[PDB]
Amino acid sequence: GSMEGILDFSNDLDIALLDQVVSTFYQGSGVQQKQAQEILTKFQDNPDAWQKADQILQFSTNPQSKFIALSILDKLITRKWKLLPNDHRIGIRNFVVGMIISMCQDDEVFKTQKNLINKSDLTLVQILKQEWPQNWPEFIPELIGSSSSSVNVCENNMIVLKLLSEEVFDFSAEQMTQAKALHLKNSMSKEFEQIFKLCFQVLEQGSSSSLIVATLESLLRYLHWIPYRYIYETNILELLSTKFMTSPDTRAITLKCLTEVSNLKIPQDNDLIKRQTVLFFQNTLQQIATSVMPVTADLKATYANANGNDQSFLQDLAMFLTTYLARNRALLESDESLRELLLNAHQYLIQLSKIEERELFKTTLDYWHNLVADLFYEPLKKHIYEEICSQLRLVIIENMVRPEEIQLYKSEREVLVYLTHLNVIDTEEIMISKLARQIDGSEWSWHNINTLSWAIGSISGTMSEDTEKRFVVTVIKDLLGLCEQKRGKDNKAVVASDIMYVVGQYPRFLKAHWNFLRTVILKLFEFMHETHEGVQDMACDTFIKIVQKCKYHFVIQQPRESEPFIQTIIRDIQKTTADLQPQQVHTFYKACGIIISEERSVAERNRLLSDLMQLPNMAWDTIVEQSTANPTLLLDSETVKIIANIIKTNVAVCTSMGADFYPQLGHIYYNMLQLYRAVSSMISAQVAAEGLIATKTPKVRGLRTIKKEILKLVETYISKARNLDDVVKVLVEPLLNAVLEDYMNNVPDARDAEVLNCMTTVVEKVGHMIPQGVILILQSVFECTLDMINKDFTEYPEHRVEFYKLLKVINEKSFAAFLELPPAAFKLFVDAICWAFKHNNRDVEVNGLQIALDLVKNIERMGNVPFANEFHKNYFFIFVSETFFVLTDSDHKSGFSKQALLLMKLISLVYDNKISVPLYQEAEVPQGTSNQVYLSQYLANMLSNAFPHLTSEQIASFLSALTKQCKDLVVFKGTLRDFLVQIKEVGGDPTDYLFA
């Protein structure tokens, strides 16, 4: 429709049309809205739009249209400001200031258009960042002056100062140069005396609560930077801790101010300051007790009820208490007159800790940690907190989380562990009585018995062995009684699981009591036949968990036993595992492997290994004999599964046995690599017979599974292998023969990225020993993988990630392999690295930059030789300019540090005269010219073309700074960050790069 009219700038702007378009955007819906959105985006991004902004602020009546006009202004002020004539700048300032004064005069508009006012304030503040105080010396005086007249203007001036404070101290680091940040901080710092007087005047006198709140808002910001004298040598602490804590409008902001006050930088050796820090805490807690709620109040109920601002306020109170007590609690611990204040503050925290709010609980839990750690180590402290700590034990236990939530569970365990050391009797009593309230039914639920089990399990190893013994016996006795009481499989399964969880958490007990350990394990075996959901997984996870800790007791011959228990386990393994799913059987075998690794007698270990692998080896041999007699049988998806499952069983035992697994690997190695080939051919055939869609079929994925598990087994062994001579001489050559060509000669969609992964490990462990092998890996995988991944950043993500891992390890361990590449393939290597830079994917990007850095180092290490000479001539400026491209493009900020490091290294090479040949071609520059001078000339030209809005002066200064600073990384980084700011605007100050 006629909506697209505003984008025609040849005519005067029709305000009526603007406001329609804006309304239709904010208040409209569907097709209408989307079209207006595109029109407003186009209007705003018109670079001549700022000119028609004063028209909108005056003539338009729609506060949204005005808001958008200021967004256009804002974009001009931050980017193109310094390019404007000086009269335009005074004009814009005058009518930004003017609009603010007039909006504050009209109480109607002042009350009902805070959005548009606040935006105008932010816009004013952008102008100050440009023009203040060098071209506006009297802003602060004239602001303090115009504060006296109108209460509204005074309120707005507090909002302006808040925003100024934010922009200079809180959000300056990323957004302005170092030189400019310092200038504005020193400028604010200079005139703050005047600003503070006005703030304190308003707080002490105090008319409009809306004014008082806005003043307190601004104070919170000032507290981030102002020196401590302003808080401790005025009356402002008394005001905050008393006056402003009583009324609810000011309470919220004031509590946050005192939180920041608790963080101020303060001399720690002055009694008067110490007393003042005590006083404001005493006042605050008193106002809480008398104006909000007493110490006994059920804060859990309050928080849940969620009336008005209660949740924010209780959050804020926890932050205040934790922050202050973390820093200052020592001040309250010696004086007996402060003892009640100390324990009341902590009693509020106990009550706050009962609140059903995960993130709040974490905040309080961090504090409890700080406290109980201190009570554990610090002399004569714990007695003070006996009753606080007793309550905390119940709070932690009742809110104990499952070990799966790793950060929270760890935090809870540490606190509870400290609390158990400080009073073991109390901890025990609480736990036993909670267990009693499960048995009588009064607190009985699945969730409740679970949490108690996790709690009891958490404190394993804190009690003495004697006490632990009596405690565990009591817990297990009771839980066993609990199981018997309960009816139905649902209930008994829960309790049985918890029984088994606690037992698994107490290995010390298990180790000292063989008969019991034996009984436990036989019971887990019985549970491996239960079909009830969860039970088999619980049985298997507990088994391997117990074994991880108690393995030595499975490998020796216990007294009164006829043999090591591992032998007993292996004999019944078929019967034991008959009803388990494949991946559960695999866990079982891994657990057995752990036990077998404890036997250090080579002869007995090997025998156990072969006994454990009996079933898979017999399955294997029958299947190898069947499938080698006719490759037809591998079509049968039942045979594909059986094969994959035998390999996985081997992966599981190899995972836990590492170097000890070698004999078992030897049993199957040659036939396994033959299977790999037969499988390989089978896959290729299906893809030629059925097309690419074949790779998605169950049959082909089955076959690919076999290959991947074979690659996984070999990777797993080699990564842990101790005898590297056998790896090279027995494993590596057959492996390379089996896999490299197959990879190279399959269509892209049929190639397994796991090949690359396997090869990465082979190069990692034994690359130094197989130079010709590493050449062969490059030849087979390099060019063909690169072609897969150099068309976009999306396709073949695994190959992409494994590719750069493989090149990284080759560049670390066997650089000579890259020297053999013909110059054309070496060029693709440089292309490949630079390609990694441009990735967002962190694994690729980080590897990309590391390869670059290590390559440079490798070339440096070659000394003055023809390949090093010719590498620099060919690829130095490619690396410099490619590194600069991702630094400055705004799309690779995650990589800044590595980019900076790479760039500094590249620049330091020329600065140190570590490149012998000229980097310039004959008669492109006078003959006697150093690389130093040419590098500066090249970079100047490069940046001038890439960023044409920069002055020659700006660029010259940047490079001067950068090259001088190419030994100090943090400063170098600073200079880069300054460059990143300056390119986003026009007329950056070249002197900024002299900052030190």
Binding site: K492, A493, T519, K523
Partner: peptide
Amino acid sequence: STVEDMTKKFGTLTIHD
């Protein structure tokens, strides 16, 4: 034999009625 006592009770643990 409080441990032996508990071990014997453990051995009769079931999920069944």
